[PDB]
Amino acid sequence: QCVNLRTRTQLPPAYTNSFTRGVYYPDKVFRSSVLHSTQDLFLPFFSNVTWFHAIHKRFDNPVLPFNDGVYFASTEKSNIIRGWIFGTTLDSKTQSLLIVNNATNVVIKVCEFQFCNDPFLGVYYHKNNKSWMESGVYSSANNCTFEYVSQPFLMDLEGKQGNFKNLREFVFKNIDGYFKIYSKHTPINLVRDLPQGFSALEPLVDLPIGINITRFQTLLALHRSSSGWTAGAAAYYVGYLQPRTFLLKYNENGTITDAVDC
Amino acid sequence: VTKFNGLTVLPPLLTDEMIAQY
Amino acid sequence: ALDPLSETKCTLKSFTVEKGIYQTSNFRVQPTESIVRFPNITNLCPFGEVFNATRFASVYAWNRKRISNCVADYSVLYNSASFSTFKCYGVSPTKLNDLCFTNVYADSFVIRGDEVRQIAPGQTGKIADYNYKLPDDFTGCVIAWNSNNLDSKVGGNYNYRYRLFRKSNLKPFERDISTEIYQAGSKPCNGVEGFNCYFPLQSYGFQPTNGVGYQPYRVVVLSFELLHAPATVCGPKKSTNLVKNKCVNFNFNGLTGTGVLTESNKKFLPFQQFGRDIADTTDAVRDPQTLEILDITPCSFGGVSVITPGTNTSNQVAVLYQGVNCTEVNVFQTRAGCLIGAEHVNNSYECDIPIGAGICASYQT
């Protein structure tokens, strides 16, 4: 709660190249067998993305900015990222947006959350009968102003052996108070922690929040057989949206198959 | 060799089959 | 506007028409109906839980139920048929279903019949000042239901109480459930009742033998709040069925215009509503209630042309609607349009009056 994770060590600002990632449908319009231009916020192609590692003391969990929206690309098998934090102060001072995934329903709220100094969504006391079951990211909250729950679902939080075969990419954008979110989940054959190719992130949900946000924080999943906890092997990336112009090649079925940065 | 805002395309007087006869 | 021949003379501004073909006007199918669609209006908030609660909270501790993130059907205010007095201020009850709001509350309490008048904007009284004040800008409603047979007890129902004294009047929608001893004179009360000191709370005299002015009345105030924030709860929207193969207007959840709806093989994703062509013009839409993809073919139109010989020859004249099939209608369809007033012949002659697509006209015996 008050004591930070002793196994936490900040890595240097490493990065790699992102060839054609960060593409998403900027609207809910259908167009097929055409090529549409548009000026909105996207990821510039062949740009750098901040790499972050999570393993027992190489464990990164900083509070990064959100001045213009960001990206995520989680190379994971047990869903190390179970939620996020968004806001300005990220404490009980101002309104703070919180997102949590309990593997059954995505909970979204906006309250004066009394977040811990080193928040998490981990577990502990797994001496026997782990079963990937839960066993306190914030101390308390009140004066809430928003509440939302996604549909029922099931997420595979269980760890798996071998090469990474799953990849999730998201976008987080505040469109005039509407905190729009995109997402995509596809299989992969990992080679260098970031497979290449092309894809498009579909919109997930519209959130009429209307709260200014300037920073964020990731909620990594910890485990222990608050301070002396451990974490499994995982890694993710971070990007930043920029106001670039793009072309969008739609197929006959309306799916984006390619793009070009102007 | 290869809409509704008042725009309309009129056809030609001579069709392609009539041109070939000439 | 007598005959198409006269439209030609008014077009050319001449009382004599030479041989040829001339344009006069523009045909256009006007709309006959209109379609209004909107997603399903289910998932209603349970207003009956408050208006018909099994038990009501006391007056000094009035209960409030927040209404948000649903479809607020306000027809229960009148259609319930379970009230004695029903009044609204500012907005009529029949229009609340069309108005969207940021927050809505249901303030319930049980007060005497004579105290029902005190539930009003800007009104003062024992209940308005010390128990539940309303603002001057109240644009909600109030419903009082006589509960003489339900919330009454012989000798007085002690479960329903109110505040009779307080050092300072309350604010609009403010609750005060304290037990501070009120001071009347210059003497200190010392936290106990005595000379010029009274208890602030008092029980009601609700009994089954009470009059119309003293019996209990289950009062519920539906408070509205239209703030700068985006609306979070709105009422059910009006809609109707679908009209196909007919020139009609469109009022969809996020699309408007005029045209004709037809079934098609197109497909919209679950996160897509309406399509667009190369020119940013809509040509497809998905129904917000049913699972179907419908192309929007606009209403027909085209220039009107008249085919006449010279005025010195005859006044018999044909008419051509360029670029449309025979709908309104001696009729013959062409690849340029529907021609009326001319008889087709299997013979071939020299082209006198051209029409289009190799077809030509003439006046012969």
Author numbering:
A (entry chain D): 14 to 69, 77 to 155, 158 to 247, 255 to 291
B (entry chain D): 826 to 827, 854 to 873
C (entry chain C): 292 to 620, 641 to 676
Any passages from the paper?
The spike (S) protein of SARS-CoV-2 is a glycoprotein that forms trimers protruding from the virion surface and mediates viral entry into cells. The S trimer uses its receptor-binding domain (RBD) to bind with the host-cell receptor ACE2, followed by a substantial structural rearrangement to fuse the viral membrane with the host-cell membrane. The Delta variant harbors multiple mutations in S protein, including two substitutions (L452R and T478K) in the RBD, the D614G substitution, a cluster of mutations in the N-terminal domain (NTD), and two more substitutions near the furin cleavage site and in the heptad repeat 1 (HR1). Here we present cryo-EM structures revealing two conformational states of Delta spike and S/ACE2 complex in four states.
To uncover the structural mechanism underlying the observed binding property changes, we carried out cryo-EM study on the Delta S trimer in complex with human ACE2 peptidase domain (PD) domain. We obtained four cryo-EM maps, including a conformation with one RBD up and engaged with an ACE2 (termed Delta S-ACE2-C1), two conformations that contain two “up” RBDs, including ACE2-bound RBD-1 and one of the RBD-2 or RBD-3 is also “up” (termed Delta S-ACE2-C2a and S-ACE2-C2b, respectively), and one conformation in which all three RBDs are up and RBD-1 is stably bound with ACE2 (termed Delta S-ACE2-C3), at 3.6-, 3.4-, 3.4-, and 3.2-Å-resolution, respectively. In the C2a/C2b/C3 maps, other than the stably associated ACE2 in RBD-1, densities of other associated ACE2s appear weaker. In mode 2, a noticeable outward movement of RBD-1-ACE2 leads to an upwards tilt of RBD-2 to the up position, associated with a downward/outward tilt of the contacting NTD-1; in the meanwhile, RBD-3 moves towards RBD-2, disturbing the original contact with the neighboring NTD-2. This motion depicts the transformation from the S-ACE2-C1 to C2a state with RBD-2 gradually opened. Moreover, mode 3 shows that with an ACE2 binding induced swing motion of RBD-1-ACE2 in an angular range of 12.2° along the NTD-1 to NTD-3 direction, the original contact between RBD-2 and RBD-3 is disturbed, leading to simultaneous upwards tilting of RBD-2 and RBD-3. This motion reveals the transition from S-ACE2-C2a to the all-RBD-up C3 state.
